[PDB]
């Protein structure tokens, strides 16, 4: 749509914004590895104490 009709900055703005969205979504979806962090906390307590 942007390359045909809509207002666009083709190579800089669109690619950069897509990259920002992709990185944020990838990090947020990395939360799907929850068991890793729950074990991380439950083991952070004993190792330190």
């Amino acid at each position: 749509l942007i390359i045909r009709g809509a207002v666009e900055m083709p190579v800089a703005e669109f690619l950069n914004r897509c990259l920002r969205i992709g990185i944020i979504v990838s990090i947020a979806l990395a939360g799907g590895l929850y068991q890793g962090e729950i074990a991380n906390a439950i083991t952070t307590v004993p190792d330190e104490l």
Partner: protein
């Protein structure tokens, strides 16, 4: 049995083609390469979880 000489046949308009901006293909392919490697790593964690 052949088209009859010197008549109006089909249109000359079907010869038209939509021009491609000669940067869309290459960078589109590379963009899909990177997004695909992200998505495959993401489903790697999806199944692993």
């Amino acid at each position: 049995q052949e088209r009859i000489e010197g008549e109006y046949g089909a249109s000359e308009l079907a010869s038209e083609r939509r021009p491609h901006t000669p940067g869309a293909r290459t960078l589109l392919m590379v963009l899909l390469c990177v997004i695909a490697v992200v998505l495959v790593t993401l489903s790697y964690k999806a199944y692993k979880v």
